[PDB]
Amino acid sequence: GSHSMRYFYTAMSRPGRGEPRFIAVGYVDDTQFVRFDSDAASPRTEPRAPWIEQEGPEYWDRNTAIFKANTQTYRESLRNLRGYYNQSEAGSHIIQRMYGCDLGPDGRLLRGHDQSAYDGKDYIALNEDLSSWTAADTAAQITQRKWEAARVAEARRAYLEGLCVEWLRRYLENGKETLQRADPPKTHVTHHPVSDHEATLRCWALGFYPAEITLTWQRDGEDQTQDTELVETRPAGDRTFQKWAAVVVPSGEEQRYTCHVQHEGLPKPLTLRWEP
Amino acid sequence: GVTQTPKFQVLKTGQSMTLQCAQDMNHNSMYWYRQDPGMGLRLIYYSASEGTTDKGEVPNGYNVSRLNKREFSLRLESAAPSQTSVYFCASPGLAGEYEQYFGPGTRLTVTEDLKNVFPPEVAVFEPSEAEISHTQKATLVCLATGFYPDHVELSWWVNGKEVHSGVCTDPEPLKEQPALNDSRYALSSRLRVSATFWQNPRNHFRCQVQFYGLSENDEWTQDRAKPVTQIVSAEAWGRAD
Amino acid sequence: QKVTQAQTEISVVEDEDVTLDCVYETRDTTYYLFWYKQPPSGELVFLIRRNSFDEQNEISGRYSWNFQKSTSSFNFTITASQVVDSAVYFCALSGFYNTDKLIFGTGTRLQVFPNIQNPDPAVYQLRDSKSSDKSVCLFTDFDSQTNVSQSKDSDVYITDKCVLDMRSMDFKSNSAVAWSNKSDFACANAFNNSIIPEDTFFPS
């Protein structure tokens, strides 16, 4: 594993009364640790993982300040993108942002990230070089010039290489027991008569971390992609993850079927069968 | 850019004054520095944001008020001679090539008594005949004596126009009594023109000194004239020789 | 934390080269460095900003910079130096964030003097005002290798040298003023306390 830290910003204009809402959440790998909501009566930045709480009050006053300021700016931005596209304040619109740093081998920036989207479709993004942008449309192009002349790119790189990398390492040491650790899937297989002459086999993977997993069914050497039913990886709600993989097989005949799971807490790719 | 009032100030020990700084660039950060000879710019106080302040390197005797996002304020509740300095206000960004991040700076002298404040005497000395026939040039000398504080601006005006070519003025004001604390100052400046241009009885050369002294608010009950902010001049006409 | 400019005052003649040294100290990984010019005028004019993560080569006409992050230095270099460059130069170090303290260097005064193409050094006396009172001595047309020390005397005032630049003529000249109200103060013996060209023209 090569650890990373992400921040997700959601700005959203209101159709009714009220100012646009700014929600920020941050993650180290697949673990959330901080949240901020501008609806909260007196809005503050709050902890979301045990290991963060050791940080002094200076740290949280520092976060609040950042997000509060970001709320005011994202309200400006919305008006602007309302204009860029020529849209009434009738319609409700969403800006998203997703930025962070991936931690390479020498414990340094492998690559930095920053992507903006408007209404779920790609807007602007910092490139790999961390000094040029990618405008997806004519409106995004207006921002680019503005951002080139303001030299946002220079402030972005300064953070991504500098503090982002520095703080991720502080977090990675201070919660290491959970963050540096991989919890393997607890796997069992399941059987349910479809017919009459058929049955579903559900291969389970519970309580695992990180979310990265690979559940595939095999009748022989060739995959059962057609037709295996795979669900999206889901939260248990205690910080672990869940997933399952299913196929319909003839009630023969289940013998001929092996499940195969791949994780990061598994030394050898674990392989399973149904047991009557 | 960033603006800064006043430009010059004179004060007596114990008194107050607020230097006002203003920034129009929407910057979060605002800084206050003093400049003193061979000392560089030392920080006093700064402001991360609206309604926030933090000590610097020399916070003693200084107070600040980050009013709004536009205006920072450096306040001296009790003046002291060791606060005689030039004060710059700073608000750095990333596009320095076309945005000014420093105020013009405010010259401030803190004296013991305002009876120390004297405007400059100005005197113009005409080119030597010896020079004219030796080098074919004419050098006038402007002399500004007995002024305190050393807040002045010297300027040469030829036929009603301020001139900058052919002009050199002293780097810093000289002291008449280096021993004394409140020593009055003196400055010299030079204007060179051709011999022919000087020999023209039509050419009008005026040396102009701008002194910054006391104001209307300032009280004064003394025999010698009140040393207000004022221009003192000295002038000569060209001459056929 | 620290920004050092070991250089206090430095002198060069026209067309000569100058390198103003500047060294910094930070524990931080990201930062940027300032260079600012303060003319005899008072104001501060921006020369360059440079991020720590940038390149090393910076040639921008006459003004040039060299940023060696390993030996923590950032050195400004003027080629073909002009009298116009005459200023006090500031190096500064800062962080990128609103909370970061912009830290300045002690400064360096650079005095660029002219290349007096045809020395004709002379001392002159300048007539009254009328009541002055009443006499002033000018020392002029010496080359830039000449120094004007203070007088020993109580009331003999002598100013340091000064650079004229008659533009329309493309002519430059150095000069110094010396005055007193002492009745013995003669322009023939005003500048004694200086090492001055012995072929200096003394009009009587």
């Binding site: 921040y7 950042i66 970001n70 994202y74 303001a150 402030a155 | 929407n26 990333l94 | 990128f96």
Partner: peptide, 13 residues
């Protein structure tokens, strides 16, 4: 820690 505020203005879109 999120990207902290710049010295200058926090640039919008």
């Amino acid at each position: 820690l999120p990207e902290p505020l710049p010295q200058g203005q926090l640039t919008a879109y």
